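Thaumatin-1
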Amino acid sequence: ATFEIVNRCSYTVWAAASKGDAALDAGGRQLNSGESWTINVEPGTNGGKIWARTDCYFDDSGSGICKTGDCGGLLRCKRFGRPPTTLAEFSLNQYGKDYIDISNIKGFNVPMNFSPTTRGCRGVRCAADIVGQCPAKLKAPGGGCNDACTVFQTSEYCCTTGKCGPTEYSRFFKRLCPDAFSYVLDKPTTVTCPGSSNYRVTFCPT
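Structure:
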């Protein structure tokens, strides 16, 4: 599958794409305002994520730090990033279907739109000013708005027992972005697309 990743933000981001134990395509790249990066993702990839990282500083060896989404100090991510991170999530060619979602379960840093570039399903977006509205206890000094699992580490927020309800924090994320996952057991906002679809992930779509 092909994913075009478009930075429509007014600032530089550092895109990332991983399936948790490996990079997708190269794994990460700088995207100044307006730049688009195309990557190829193998059919059958399950549990892939794409996200934006902010305020990074990388040396000539590709090692450094970001204030949101850092993946172990690397430019080219092999692992998932450190919250807060808005997430584009996808598993491809699963019994003839692709499944995509946006998630705020690991917090929110940048607005994103996740839309197919081929026919037969709809896209999803989370573009509200979550950082500006972020409850004081969830605000990340580095930038962004953390999830309450990250902030408090309780069974209820982290849904560790597999039974957990919505919370006042989850409802915040849900009120601003109803079409993204707000907690581990939220009613699914997953979109089912035809197998082998292609997609565009845009940062700061509006």
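The domain at 1-206 is CATH 2.60.110.10 (Thaumatin).
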